[PDB]
Write a protein that binds this DNA or RNA. Structure first.
Lengths: 193, 193, 193, 193, 193
DNA sequence: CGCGTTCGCTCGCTCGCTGGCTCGTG
DNA sequence: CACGAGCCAGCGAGCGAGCGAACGCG
């Protein structure tokens, strides 16, 4: 069946405070990117911090891209951009197929190095553990959950906490940016158990 | 010989008054469960609050199940559902075999938490001490009685006070739901003493 | 709100009687450190055992530093160096934020070991429980108090019992080394309750 | 001031009648121990049951030893070995300093258990209440007297009722084994009141 | 002094029940091995399940051998093959000398993996916990007893419960397969304590 | 005395740490 | 290749609810 690893990445929303030394082309880029809610959505765009989302998106892209290089395939995934009490963080779920838990982290450290070079122009974000692999516990091994995790902990999130979502997993392509669709699946899930 | 611990559980009846926040699936469940008196019984089914019994049963089940997980065995028992002045409460008698009096609670309480998650969908019953271990007194030890306790204090009970009973203890499998069989053993007991 | 843990450290005053084997560089260090009362103070510097205070401070510094490594933040605190019938002892109050009662102990332990290697050049102080966490009672939970604990039990102290104080908590920055400012807050406290 | 607790222990003087099961090494030990009266004494060593005294001494040693483990200090004391109408019994007076009135029991109970293991080789003396804490009354609270209690009730005792005594309390170190010294202080006491 | 760890191993004495998939060469091996009681023995060989003992021995050998690889020495030991109500199980005691309680399990496991490959030709015995280490208590450290444990709990055993014994520990080389030598040391032990 | 309140001791559960493998990269 | 970062099962001090004798006032 489908099993996934979870890698949480914090979004360094502030230029100088998080990325001291970054050029302007960066600050202009994050700005010169306007987000638009697709037809089937129903989210309040006013509650979607666009500047951050623009960064989180790039992150996600490079991540998945660089990841598929290892998995040697089109890894089914489900990214959810969240905004919490501390800071923004991308909840990413990729399918294990192709990456043995014994070597996941040797690869994430390859992607992390890449995010920096591409997204942040070789600048190390001054954020503590901005790319952490979800373990079963401290010193435990890579967690690994099944599809069920999405509607169980990810879907129930609602703005402003919820910001955006992505996913090539058909079963949730609509639940991505639609609080209604979600509420449905989220209910269904709590039922069949 | 056979020794038993006694754990009294108050069975909640008013979904709102006792379990505020509970969904509907629960209220529908307790309802969609009809009780029928087995052939050898002789009780007035009209005096058996089925809605509560439905809950008391589930409690009983999960309690025993979770309990055998500790006793590492098929613990002999005898549960009696009673209805009193204050509220309904399951008189449970499990054999000590395997549970030291010093660590009774830690396990008992491990169960309580379970009942909540399973039976009441993570909702803490607003009832004072709905799961109390019977103490020989104040600051006393966990009271532990022998088989004789059943016919001595449990069997004598008659409707409406008595609502139902369970037991894998052959010696009383018929006295469970039969006021006649009970009156017999109850008398016998009073005799051989 | 702000909640704090309390870690009492007995400061080993007598070099040879408490730290047998310690070099001279240590004894010289504690001596070559002259303390001076800040302008806003009003303490009798004559009653402030500088040699011990020099050590208590080092202790304090390392403690806090190492502590923030755990809390992953600038933990609000309030340390008060006291001198009693038995021996000097730093009353430390750090905010719980970050350290779950369960693990508090394995954290202070690492610190303790750190204090030895850094402050006492790996020499184990021959003092009974020189670093002890406050419990709400033998076998009880790690006592966690709120800001109020400070003016309630710490501020009322006056020389010679009081020796010094530290704190990044603005509300008491002046009460630290000012018996007058103290008496003020100490009074206000006893009133508003 | 100096306050004391009183624990009366019944020294098992009949190897078989009181300690059934004890080995021989014990009976040989008590025998191979000859008592001698120190220079300042004046007691008739002929009236001093050596065999019992040998056990009473061991008892007293272990008692005080184990006790100091609790009081965390050198507890001032005054043990008097007496011989009554029923049996020999050590009158022990230790200073409360360190042992609250709500826990004296649990601490003595531990000592008792220790005396058995060390002194009597895990053999429970068949003597009713051989280790009783002196109370104010039956059902009362743990009694506690001051230094005055020694010359008031303990010193007056004279052979054969008086067998021996001990005490790290200077004021009575001579009155211990000297009927003369005692009679003096005993006199002085009755006067200054 | 001599301290030992205790590793209990069951004995998968069933080709079709415990080792499904095993070849015949194995079943023929355990059979083509006839045990004989040494001269100094006195055991009833009729009560010695030879087929199991043949496996238990191989287990023991590989174990010890592999173990000395870690200990970097000739580890003093004492293995006792026992037959219980559930199944056969080798009581093994190896001297800690060289294996820090921290890596015990990590090593034993390497041994377990070796037993499988060598003794059972890569077939995982379908027995629950067939190679368990004994700990003081849950959450406690690995149990480490001294020489005395042998006569204290191991020697008393008598057929059919006792099946055999090994040991390079001179002091018990004879008590190994002699119920008489055992009874002596077993007695002596109970005395000198 | 009976009976309710202390409060030292018990002992399963938690969760960061140890330290021998594993396996891709330079 | 060997390293050496990432891995993680095994570990066990620390914890804190519970338990129950000891106690001692009404």
């Amino acid at each position: 069946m489908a099993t996934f690893y979870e890698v949480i990445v914090r979004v360094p929303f502030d230029v100088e405070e998080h990325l001291p030394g970054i050029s302007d082309s960066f600050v202009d880029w994050v700005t010169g990117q306007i987000w638009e809610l697709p037809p089937e959505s129903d989210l309040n765009l006013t509650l979607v911090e666009q500047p951050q989302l623009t960064v989180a998106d790039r992150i996600r892209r490079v991540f998945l891209y660089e990841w598929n290089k290892f998995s040697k395939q089109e890894s089914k995934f489900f990214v959810q951009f969240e905004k919490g009490s501390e800071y923004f963080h991308l909840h990413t779920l990729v399918e294990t197929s192709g990456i043995s838990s014994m070597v996941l982290g040797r690869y994430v450290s390859q992607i992390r190095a890449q995010l920096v070079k591409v997204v942040f122009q070789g600048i190390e974000p001054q954020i503590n553990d901005w790319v952490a692999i979800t373990k079963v516990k401290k010193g435990g091994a890579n967690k690994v959950v099944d599809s069920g995790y999405i509607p169980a902990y990810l879907l129930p999130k609602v703005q402003p906490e919820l910001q955006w979502a992505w996913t090539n997993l058909d079963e949730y392509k609509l639940a991505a940016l639609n609080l209604e669709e979600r509420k449905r699946l989220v209910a269904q899930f709590l039922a069949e158990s």
